[PDB]
């Protein structure tokens, strides 16, 4: 989640 969300952002 940490990576996924920060990539999206
Ligand atoms: Co964060």
Query: If you measure from the C-alpha of residue 7 to the centroid of ligand 1, how many angstroms do you get, rounded to a whole number?
Result: 10
Query: If you measure from the C-alpha of residue 4 to the centroid of ligand 1, how many angstroms do you get, rounded to a whole number?
Result: 10
Q: Which residue has the tokens 């920060």?
A: 6
Query: If you measure from the C-alpha of residue 6 to the centroid of ligand 1, how many angstroms do you get, rounded to a whole number?
Result: 6
The Cα 6–Cα 4 span in angstroms is: 6
The Cα 1–Cα 9 span in angstroms is: 12
Query: If you measure from the C-alpha of residue 1 to the centroid of ligand 1, how many angstroms do you get, rounded to a whole number?
Result: 9
Query: If you measure from the C-alpha of residue 2 to the centroid of ligand 1, how many angstroms do you get, rounded to a whole number?
Result: 6
B/e letters for 1-9, b = 16+ CB within 10 Å, e = fewer, are eeeeeeeee
What DSSP letter does each residue of 1-9 carry, written as one string? -HHHHHHH-
């Amino acid at each position: 989640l940490a990576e996924a969300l920060h990539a999206a952002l």
